Amino acid sequence: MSLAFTKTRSTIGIVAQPVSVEVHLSNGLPSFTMVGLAETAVKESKDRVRSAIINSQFEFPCRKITVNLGPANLPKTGSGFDLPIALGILAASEQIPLTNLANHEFIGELALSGELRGVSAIIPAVLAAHKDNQHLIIANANAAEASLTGHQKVFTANNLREVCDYLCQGTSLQSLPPKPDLLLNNYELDWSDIKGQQHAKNAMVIAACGGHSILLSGAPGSGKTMMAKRFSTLLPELSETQALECAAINSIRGKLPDFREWRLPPFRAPHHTASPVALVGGGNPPKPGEISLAHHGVLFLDELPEFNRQVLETLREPLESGHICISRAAAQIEFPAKFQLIAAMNPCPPDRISRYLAKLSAPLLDRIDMQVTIHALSQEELIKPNTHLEKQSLAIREKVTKMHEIQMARQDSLNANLNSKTCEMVCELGSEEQLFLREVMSKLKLSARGYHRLLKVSRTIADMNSSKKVLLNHLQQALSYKQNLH
Amino acid sequence: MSLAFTKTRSTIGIVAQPVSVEVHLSNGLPSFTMVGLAETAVKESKDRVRSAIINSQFEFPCRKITVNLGPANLPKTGSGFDLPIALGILAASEQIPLTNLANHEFIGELALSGELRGVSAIIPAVLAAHKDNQHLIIANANAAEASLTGHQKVFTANNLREVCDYLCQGTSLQSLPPKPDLLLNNYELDWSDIKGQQHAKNAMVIAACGGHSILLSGAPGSGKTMMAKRFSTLLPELSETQALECAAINSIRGKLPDFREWRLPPFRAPHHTASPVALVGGGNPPKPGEISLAHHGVLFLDELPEFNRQVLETLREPLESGHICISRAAAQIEFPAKFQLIAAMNPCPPDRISRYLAKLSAPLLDRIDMQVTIHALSQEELIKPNTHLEKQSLAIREKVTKMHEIQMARQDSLNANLNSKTCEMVCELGSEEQLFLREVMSKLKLSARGYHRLLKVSRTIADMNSSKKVLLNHLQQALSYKQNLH
Amino acid sequence: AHKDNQHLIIANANAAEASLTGHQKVFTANNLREVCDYLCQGTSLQSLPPKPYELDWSDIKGQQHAKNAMVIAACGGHSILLSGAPGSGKTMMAKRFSTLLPELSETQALECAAINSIRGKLPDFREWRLPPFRAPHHTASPVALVGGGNPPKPGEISLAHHGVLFLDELPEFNRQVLETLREPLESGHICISRAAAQIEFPAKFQLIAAMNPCPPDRISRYLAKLSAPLLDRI
Amino acid sequence: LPDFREWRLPPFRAPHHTASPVALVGGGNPPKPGEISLAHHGVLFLDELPEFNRQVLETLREPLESGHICISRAAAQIEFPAKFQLIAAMNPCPPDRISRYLAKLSAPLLDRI
Amino acid sequence: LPDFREWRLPPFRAPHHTASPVALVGGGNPPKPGEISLAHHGVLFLDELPEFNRQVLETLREPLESGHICISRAAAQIEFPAKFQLIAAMNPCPPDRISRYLAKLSAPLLDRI
DNA sequence: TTTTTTTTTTTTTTTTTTTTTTTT
DNA sequence: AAAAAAAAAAAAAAAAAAAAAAAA
Numbered sequence A, B: 001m002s003l004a005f006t007k008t009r010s011t012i013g014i015v016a017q018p019v020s021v022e023v024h025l026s027n028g029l030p031s032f033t034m035v036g037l038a039e040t041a042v043k044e045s046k047d048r049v050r051s052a053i054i055n056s057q058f059e060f061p062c063r064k065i066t067v068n069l070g071p072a073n074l075p076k077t078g079s080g081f082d083l084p085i086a087l088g089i090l091a092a093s094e095q096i097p098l099t100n101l102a103n104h105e106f107i108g109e110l111a112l113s114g115e116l117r118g119v120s121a122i123i124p125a126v127l128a129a130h131k132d133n134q135h136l137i138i139a140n141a142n143a144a145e146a147s148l149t150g151h152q153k154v155f156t157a158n159n160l161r162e163v164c165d166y167l168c169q170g171t172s173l174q175s176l177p178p179k180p181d182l183l184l185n186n187y188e189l190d191w192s193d194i195k196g197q198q199h200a201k202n203a204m205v206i207a208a209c210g211g212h213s214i215l216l217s218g219a220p221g222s223g224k225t226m227m228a229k230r231f232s233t234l235l236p237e238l239s240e241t242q243a244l245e246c247a248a249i250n251s252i253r254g255k256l257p258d259f260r261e262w263r264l265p266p267f268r269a270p271h272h273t274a275s276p277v278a279l280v281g282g283g284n285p286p287k288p289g290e291i292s293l294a295h296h297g298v299l300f301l302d303e304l305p306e307f308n309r310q311v312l313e314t315l316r317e318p319l320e321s322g323h324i325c326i327s328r329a330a331a332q333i334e335f336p337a338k339f340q341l342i343a344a345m346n347p348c349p350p351d352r353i354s355r356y357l358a359k360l361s362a363p364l365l366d367r368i369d370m371q372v373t374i375h376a377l378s379q380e381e382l383i384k385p386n387t388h389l390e391k392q393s394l395a396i397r398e399k400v401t402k403m404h405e406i407q408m409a410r411q412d413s414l415n416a417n418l419n420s421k422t423c424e425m426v427c428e429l430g431s432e433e434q435l436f437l438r439e440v441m442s443k444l445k446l447s448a449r450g451y452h453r454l455l456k457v458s459r460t461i462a463d464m465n466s467s468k469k470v471l472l473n474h475l476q477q478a479l480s481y482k483q484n485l486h
Numbered sequence C: 001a002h003k004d005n006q007h008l009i010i011a012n013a014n015a016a017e018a019s020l021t022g023h024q025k026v027f028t029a030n031n032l033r034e035v036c037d038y039l040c041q042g043t044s045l046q047s048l049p050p051k052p053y054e055l056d057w058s059d060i061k062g063q064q065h066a067k068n069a070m071v072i073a074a075c076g077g078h079s080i081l082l083s084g085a086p087g088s089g090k091t092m093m094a095k096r097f098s099t100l101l102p103e104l105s106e107t108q109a110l111e112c113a114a115i116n117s118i119r120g121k122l123p124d125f126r127e128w129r130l131p132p133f134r135a136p137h138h139t140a141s142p143v144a145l146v147g148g149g150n151p152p153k154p155g156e157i158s159l160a161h162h163g164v165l166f167l168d169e170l171p172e173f174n175r176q177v178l179e180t181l182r183e184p185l186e187s188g189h190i191c192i193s194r195a196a197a198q199i200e201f202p203a204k205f206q207l208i209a210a211m212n213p214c215p216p217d218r219i220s221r222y223l224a225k226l227s228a229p230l231l232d233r234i
Numbered sequence D, E: 001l002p003d004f005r006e007w008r009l010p011p012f013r014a015p016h017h018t019a020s021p022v023a024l025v026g027g028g029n030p031p032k033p034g035e036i037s038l039a040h041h042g043v044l045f046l047d048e049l050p051e052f053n054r055q056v057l058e059t060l061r062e063p064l065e066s067g068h069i070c071i072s073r074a075a076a077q078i079e080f081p082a083k084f085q086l087i088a089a090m091n092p093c094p095p096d097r098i099s100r101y102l103a104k105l106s107a108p109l110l111d112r113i
Numbered sequence F: 001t002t003t004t005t006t007t008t009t010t011t012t013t014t015t016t017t018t019t020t021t022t023t024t
Numbered sequence G: 001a002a003a004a005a006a007a008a009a010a011a012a013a014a015a016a017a018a019a020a021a022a023a024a
C-alpha cells in the first residue's frame, strides 16, 4: 500500500535500543501527526522534514501523514530523527524503492536546505549497529567521532539527496576516515614514583593480579589516594570491545577522551559526599554517574564511613552482579558497573569507636577482601632522594597479564568472582594444608565467608610464587590480610 | 525555489555557540512557523520582525514562512534574534542579494519602527566573531560595550534600512568608536597604606610571586581584609586575551565594569550568606557564580570557620582543574575558575578550641600553601604619622612580572602548581640542606604533604635571592611562612 | 487471567516471559488478521513453549533432637527460634529448611514470579516452584528490609513470600524496624503508605530467628532489646 | 502609604529578634525592600543583639560600610539603600557558660560598633 | 471493610502497648483515623499505661471530655469524633524506685480515672 | 552513674517553569 | 491557531523524625 519502515536508534540509558519509524499515508485532508512519546525537540521536526524534502527537489505528499516511533513506551529525546522520518516519507510515496531500506539504519538531523547535521552521543549507536550487523548512515559532521571505533559498514553523507542516490542508484559515497594513530601510553605517574612502602605495594600488586577489592586503612595524611592513583597503572590494557564500551559511556556524558587514553583503565574517584543521584545513575533523562562511569576501571572510595547509608546499600548490586537498575517509574534501564573497588578508611579520630565502626556498612564491608595499614613514611625515607631504579610498570603489567591468562585458562572468571561451591573444586588442597586451616580456626573464629576469602587471596599468592597449588607459606602471608584489626 | 541562510551567536554559559538561522518560503497559507527550541522570549519575534520589515518600506512575503534556529538541541535564550530573522526573510524574498551574507554575523533586537535595540551580554559574541574572523553587525546601543575589545571588524547600525543599504550598495555603516581617552593607571590603592606589618607584608610578597595560596590569622580590626584587598595590585597586569575573558564573564553577569580597571586582576570576596548555587554555577540558563567571577584573580574567604561546609565542599574541583562543570541534563557547561586563594580566620573564638577548628574542611586547608599571623601593630608605629610617601606598588609588581617569567622558563606551571615528582630536580638540595631538613623534621611532626608544601615556598624564596638552589637560608625563612599551625 | 480464569491473547514478542510460567490458555499472535481469524474461525494460534539439586537434611549428622523439631515446625507451619551460642554461624540448619517445605502450586509460585518480576531483570536461571529462602543481613535498612521508597519496589520480606525468613542475631536489629514486621505475620500482607497512596505487597512467610544469650548477668541485657510482639508470635 | 504625617522624620524600625532572614534583609518574589532597607537614613534598633543568628548578623557588615545592601537572587541582583545608623542592646549574660553566650555574637560586627 | 462484624454492637479496640504516636491519634498522608478515633461509642482498653509515650497520654486530654481530636496538618482540620470509655490496668511492680516507676504514669490522665 | 537538645535528613508546601488542553 | 487549566519538576523555605552530641 502506502506505508514504509525505517530503523533508527535512540540513546536511552547507555544502550541504543532499536527504534522503528513507521510512516503511513491516507486519503484525508493534509496533516502531520507524530505518535509516540516524542519530546518537543522531536515534535518540532515536522517542518524541518517538510522543508528538507521540498528543497531537495522531491515531491512532498499532500495527504494525511502518520508517523509512529515504535515502541511507544520509551520517551524519545534525541534530535536525530529527521533523516529516518524523511526517508520513510519518501519511501511511502514510492519515490524510493522500498526493498533497499531493510538492512540500513539512519541517524542525523536535517537543516532546511537538506544538508545533514550531526547529533551528540553517537558512538553507542555505532556499537549497537555493528552488534546487530546493520549498515549505518551518519551525518558527515559525526565522522570525526565515529571513526574512533574504526568500524566498517558505516557510511556518511552531506545531503539528503546523497542518501537517496546511494539507496536508489547505488552510487556509494563517503566512508569513515581512517583510524587515528595507535600511539603509546604517555602514562607518566608510574609505580616507581612512590617511596618504599613495600607491604602496601606488594599487597596492591597481589590484588591487581587477583582483581580483589582492598581497604586502605591507616592514619590520614599518609598516602591513601596517592598510592591508589597509581593502581590503575598496574591493570592491563583493555580489549577493543571494552575500550569501545568505556568510550560510549564517556560519550553519553559528553566529554570525549583525547584519542589516547582509549586503552587506559579509568579511575574517576568520586567526591567526599556528592549526591546519590549524581554518583549512581540520575533522574531527568537518566545519565550515567560515577558508579556507571569507570565501568572496567578502578573506582576509589576515600572516607568510606562518611558516605550515606542508602548509597552504600545501593552499591551492593554492582559487586554482586555488575548492573544498576535505577527505575524511571514507567520502566527500568540497566547500567554496567563491573568495576574494581579500592577503599580508604581512617581508624577513628575510645567510646566513639563502637558507633564509628558500626556506622560503616557491613554489606559493603564483606566483599572487601584485603586490608592494609599504610604507616606514615619515616623521615629518612621521605628526605632521601629517589634513585628511580628506572621506570617500573611494564614488568608488573606483564606479570598481571600472565596471571590473568592463567586464571582464564582454569575457569571463566577471576578469583575475586569465584563462587563458594567452585572454590573447593578448583583449588588443589593438601591434607596438611586442610589440617593447618582447621588449626587456624582454633586461634581465630573466622566467619563462613572467611574460608573463601582466605582461599581466594592464597590462590593468587600461590599462583604468584611459581605455580601449582596452595602452600603453608602462601596462607601464612594471606593471614596478614584479615578483615579488620579492632 | 529560494531559501536563505544567516549566521548569529547565542550565548550559553560563557562561550557563544554559533547558531545558523534558516528561512524557507512555501506556497501554502500565510503562516509563520518557528522551530528549534525557541524560548518564549524569542518565540514572539514573529510580530516584531513582521512590523520591522513592513515599516522599513520593504515587502513582507505573503507566503508560508518556516524559520529554523541552528542546532535543534540548543535552547535559544537571547532576545537578539530579530535582526538575523529579518535579514533572512528579506534574502529569501530576493529583496537582498544572497552573496553578500556569506561571512557576516548579525545580532540585534528590532523595534516596530525598524530601529535596532541593544542586546545585553554582547561581549562574548564579539569575542567569538573575532575568533572566527567574521564581520559582526550590532545595534548602535552596544557600541560602548563592544569598544572594549577594539576589534576592527565590528560595525554598528541604527536601523534595518542601514543594514540593507550596507549589504546592497556598500554604504559602509558606522564603525565602532575608538578606545576611551584614558590610560592613567592610578587605582588609588597600593601597598603603602598597610603600615607596620613588615613580616606579613613580606610574606604576602612571596605569596604573589609564586601563585601560592595563603592563610591569614590574626586579631580582627588589623589589616587582614585590607591586605587582601591591596593584594590585587601586586599581581601583574593581565594580558589582552585574559582581559577579554574577564570582561566577557563580567558582561555576561551584567555588571559592566569601568574602563579604568579593565586590566587589573579581579578581586571578589564571597559573602557568608550564599547558596551553594550562588558561589558556583547557577540555576535557570546557567550564569557565572561568585567563584568564576574571580577568574584570573584573587578569591578572599574571610572568616573561614563560617561558610557552612555545604558551600566549601564545592570549591574543591576548581582548585585543581581550574574550571567547574555544571550539568543541565541535556548538555555540559564549563565555567573558568582559575584563581588564587586567600583566606582569613580568627585563631581563637579549654578543649573547645578543637571543636572550633573541627568545622574546617581539612582538604581545603591541604591546598593552602602558606600561613602567617597578623601580630598586633606596635604602639608608636601606628601612633607615628604616615609622612612617608615611598609608595611601593610598581616596584613589587615589576619584580613579580619577571618572577613569573623566571618560573615559567623551567616548567609549565608556577611554583604553586608543581607536581610532587617535580619538587625534586628543581630544588637541588645540597648535603647540608638534607641535614637541616632532617633535624627540623625530627623535632616537628610534619606530614608528607607538609614536606612538599615546605619545598615549594622555599623554592620561591630561593628565587627571590636569584640563587640556583636553596642555600639553607631560604629553608629557615620558609619554616616561618610554613607550619600551618592551628 | 489465571485467577479470573480468562484466556489471554498476547503479542508474540512477549512469549519469552509468559512461557516462564508454563501456563495454558495463553495464546500469542502476530497480526490483527491472525486474531480476527481466531475469533471468526479459530485458527489455533501458538501456545508458548512449555517448560519441563540443593542440599538436604542428610548433610547434617544425627541431631535427632533439633531435626524432628524442625520437621514438626515445617509440618505445622509454625515459626522456630533456633538459637544458642554462635557456633560457626549455625545458618546451615536454616538453609536446609527451605528444602523441606511442600512444592508451591501454580498460583503460589506465579505470585512470587510477579513479585520478582517487578524488580526487573527477572532471576537468571530457573527454580520458580522452589520457595525462596532470602535472609536479611543483620543490619539491613528500614527502606530495604520493609516495604520501600521512591517508586515502590518490594522489600526483602515480600520477596520471601511463601518462603522462609532467617533473621539472625535478633537482639541487635532495630527496635523500630522489628515492630514494622507485625502486619505481615498477622494478616499476610503489608500496607506501607507514603505520599499519594499505598499498595499491598503480599508477605506471607515463616520466621526462623537466632540469638545469643551471652556467657555474667549480661543475659538479661542481651534479651532486654527484644521486641515483645515479635517474640510473642514465635 | 504614609502621607503628610512623618515624611520628614527619620524612620525607626526595630525588627523582632527572630523574624526571618528573607524579611530582615532583602527578600524573594519580585523583590520588596526588607527591614534593613526600610530604615534608610534612619535608626535601626536590635534589642538582645546576641539572640540574632550569626548568619543574619554577618550580613550587617556590608551595608554598614558600602551603604547599600546587594541582594543575590541567583540570576538577578538589585540594590537597596541601607545607609541606616545602628543601635544595639545586649545582656551581659543571665564557667564556660559565659564563653558559650558570647560566642553567639559576631566579633567583627561588635568590634565595628 | 473486614468481615460482616456486628456494627450494631459497641466496638472494642486495644492499642499495641508500645503503639505509635501517629497510630493512636490522627495520621499522616490524607487524614487517616487513629486508634483512639476508633472505638467510637465503644470501649478503649489501655493496658500497662507507663509503657506508653508520655506526650500521647497527655494528648488524650480533649478526647475523654470533648469527644473530638481534630488534627492539624496546617492545611485542614478534620474532626474524627472519638467518644469512648476508658479502661486501664496496672501492675503494682516489684523500694525507693517505686517513685521512679510512678513518675511515668501521666498524672493528668490518672486524674480522669 | 542519669537524662536532654540540636542538627541533618526527609518530607511537605509553595512558586515558577514547564507542559497539556481548550476555544476561537 | 493562539491559551489557559492541569501534571511534573527544580529550587527555596519550614516542619517532623533521627542522630549524637552533651549535658546533668
Ligand SMILES: Nc1ncnc2c1ncn2[C@@H]1O[C@H](COP(=O)(O)OP(=O)(O)NP(=O)(O)O)[C@@H](O)[C@H]1O
Binding pocket: A193, A194, A195, A196, A197, A219, A220, A221, A222, A223, A224, A225, A226, A227, A377, B420, B421, B448, B449, B452
Ligand atoms: N609513599 C609516598 N611516597 C612518595 N610520596 C608520597 C608518599 N606519600 C605521600 N607522598 C606525598 O604526598 C603528597 C601528596 O600525596 P598525599 O599526601 O597522599 O595526598 P592525599 O592522598 O590526597 N591525602 P593522604 O593520603 O591522607 O595523605 C605528594 O607530595 C606526594 O609526593
Ligand SMILES: Nc1ncnc2c1ncn2[C@@H]1O[C@H](COP(=O)(O)OP(=O)(O)NP(=O)(O)O)[C@@H](O)[C@H]1O
Binding pocket: B193, B194, B195, B196, B197, B219, B220, B221, B222, B223, B224, B225, B226, B377, D108
Ligand atoms: N596598618 C593598618 N593596619 C591595620 N588596620 C589599618 C591600618 N591602616 C588603616 N587601617 C584601617 O583600619 C581598617 C581595618 O580594616 P579591617 O580590620 O580589615 O575591617 P574588616 O573588613 O571588617 N576585616 P577585619 O580585619 O576582620 O576586621 C582599614 O579599613 C583601614 O581603614
